[PDB]
Amino acid sequence: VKEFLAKAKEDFLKKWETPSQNTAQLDQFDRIKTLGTGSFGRVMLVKHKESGNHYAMKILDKQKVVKLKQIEHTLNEKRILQAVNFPFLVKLEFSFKDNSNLYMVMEYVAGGEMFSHLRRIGRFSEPHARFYAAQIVLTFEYLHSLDLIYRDLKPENLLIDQQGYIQVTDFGFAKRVKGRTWTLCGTPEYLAPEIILSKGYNKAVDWWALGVLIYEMAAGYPPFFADQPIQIYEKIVSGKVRFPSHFSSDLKDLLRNLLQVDLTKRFGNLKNGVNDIKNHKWFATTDWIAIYQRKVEAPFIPKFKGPGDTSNFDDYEEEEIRVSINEKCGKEFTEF
């Protein structure tokens, strides 16, 4: 693994140092339907005219980005996504900007958000959750080795591909940092205590988030929930966690080590790093190599009828994508 990660870093650094820019233009695509919206952008299913291929276009209104103080974050998002390469990370096919917006064109992951399946089914059995968890563990090992912190793990940001495997999207809060950082960002239910406490944090927050994800996948609800974020933060800081009666002893033990407020004790942040997680009893049946190689049979394969099918996604109110005749925030997004 150490051998692999070294080469991976060389590839990443080359792209990090000389990022890809202006690889397409708006009129090369036909916009079809909105696949999802967030606090920042709108992702639409589009069809590339010359190739006939479908893609997922994330559209960010430059003025909204500025308003929400996401300038640096958006630059991080694109610079990082264009430089990464891993089996469970969505691929950025093109990127470009116009007078009004910023565009990130990714491969279209037709299976829908893990979120939709999770809410519909209720919860995932342990082997089912384990399958997904293993992919996240490997992905974080990869990202962290490049000095990258992901910062937004959640079912809404995880897509299921045609083979039932995970595709991580939304690098909105991804950041390349050696040491600690302080930005209060992420999604309420998934924030590690150190983020909420404004004391500074590191990659260990991703491992805490993994704990929240595994818990939510297996339980069907998050370990800390309430009607308002403030109430959620109170619960997270208290640290008290209760487990469903159906949780195996192994799962509970793993979760107590991930949802650990003590940084000197949280799994993934210890001497053995990610190995404390990979070697944990809950993952005993996991063939890490087989997972990386995508040779494991997926516990669930989404239904899909031809290219362009969006049946695995909720419907959203469509909105006109306007483009002024005057360039907005040109200097701010020069490197995009």
Binding site: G36, G38, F40, L68, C185, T187, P222
Partner: peptide, 20 residues
């Protein structure tokens, strides 16, 4: 039950990232 309390809560739908 905890499940019932979650289901009756206002945060069972897609959760957006924190924005100041």
């Amino acid at each position: 039950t905890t499940y019932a309390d979650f289901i009756a809560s206002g945060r069972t739908g897609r959760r957006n990232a924190i924005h100041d």
